[PDB]
């Protein structure tokens, strides 16, 4: 009866909890904000982005690239709204990656992704994601290549849960169920996560039940500097790597540098060389082989000048 639900929720709200965010973001500050891993590239790269409006967000992008595992050309377009976000990008070889996110409810959103490769049968993947963001938790279920055609379920199904335990501590869970086909038995994995977040530092751990462990620590070293440490241990042979890095935010540039136990040094400099133009320098150095990989990239955004008067749409479900 509602008599319990009303009293139960009132006690729940008195605990001062907040939404802990996604399980995949539990270590975002180290692995994405401080570390270079997601910004590293080699060769030449150029992105030309034209923004046609901010509400609804609509922009078109052309990427030219010549480098390791970089497709020569990629056309992209995105359309955003407070309730929806559609994105598509296609390679010169016809590989199409699509995104369609829709807010059915302010708390419930469905994310649909397709990957279509024409030249190679490869993986033509369909991923159906359902996220619920509660007052103090978030729950997600992903279905990747779901099928019932063989008379039984097939594909990869991932459940995720993250719960705020205290205003600082969140604990969570991820569970996977897999079956390549009815010829084989289903495979299941469980991962445990947790995070302690304060204003100046954040600690996170990801524990795969099969033996892998990822621990990360982030700390703000003043207004312009932040640093973080990322340790990955695999004991499934035994392998361990620790990456330490720092990020500096200047008025017109951001500098990142990191070193890791495998002797790899890498740095990324992003520099606002002009009002619409941002240059990127990325360098990777392996001290064991004395080999370096250098990436120079440019980004230009024509659209914004005319549209600055108009305002970006709130809560686009990217």
């Amino acid at each position: 009866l509602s008599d319990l639900y009303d009293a139960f929720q009132e006690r729940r709200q008195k605990l001062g909890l907040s939404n802990p965010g996604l399980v995949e973001n539990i270590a975002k500050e180290v692995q994405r904000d401080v570390l270079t891993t997601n910004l590293m590239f080699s060769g030449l790269r150029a992105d030309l982005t034209k923004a046609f409006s901010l509400n609804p967000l609509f922009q078109v992008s052309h990427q030219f690239a010549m480098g390791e595992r970089l497709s020569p050309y990629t056309f992209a377009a995105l359309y955003g709204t407070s309730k929806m976000f559609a994105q598509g990008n296609i390679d010169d070889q016809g590989n199409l990656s699509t995104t369609f996110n829709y807010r059915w409810t302010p708390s419930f959103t469905t994310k649909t992704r397709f990957q279509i490769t024409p030249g190679a049968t490869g993986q033509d993947m369909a991923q159906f994601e359902h996220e619920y963001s509660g007052a103090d938790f978030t729950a997600t279920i992903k279905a990747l290549n779901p099928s019932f055609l063989e008379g039984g379920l097939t594909g990869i199904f991932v459940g995720q849960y993250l719960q705020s335990i205290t205003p600082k501590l969140s604990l969570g869970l991820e569970a996977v169920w897999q079956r390549a086909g009815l010829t084989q038995g289903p495979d299941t994995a469980i991962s445990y996560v947790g995070r302690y977040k304060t204003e100046n530092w954040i600690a996170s751990a990801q524990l795969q039940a099969q033996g892998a462990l990822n621990a990360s620590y982030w700390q703000r070293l003043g207004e312009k500097v932040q640093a973080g440490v990322d340790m990955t241990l695999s004991v499934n042979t035994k392998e361990g790597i620790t990456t330490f890095g720092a990020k500096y935010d200047f008025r017109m540039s951001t500098f990142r540098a990191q070193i890791d136990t495998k002797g790899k040094l890498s740095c990324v400099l992003e520099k606002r060389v002009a009002a619409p133009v941002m240059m990127t320098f990325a360098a990777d150095v392996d001290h064991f082989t004395q080999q370096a990989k250098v990436g120079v990239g440019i980004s230009i955004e024509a659209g914004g000048e005319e549209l600055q008067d108009q305002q970006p749409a709130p809560n686009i479900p990217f």
Partner: protein, 51 residues
């Protein structure tokens, strides 16, 4: 368990949907943008990179 004809036809729908997605997904986004952006750009300018 299953049905042979039902599986054959269902798979055929997926390859129709796959082809429609492959060819129609980006033109769809461009249509949503072109008709709902404020202001509305030109058809040629809609795909111009920096002009």
């Amino acid at each position: 368990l299953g049905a042979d004809s039902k599986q054959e036809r269902i798979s055929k729908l997926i390859e129709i949907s796959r082809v429609v997605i492959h060819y129609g997904y980006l033109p769809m986004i461009l249509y949503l943008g072109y008709t709902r952006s404020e202001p509305k750009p030109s058809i040629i300018r809609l795909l111009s990179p920096l002009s």
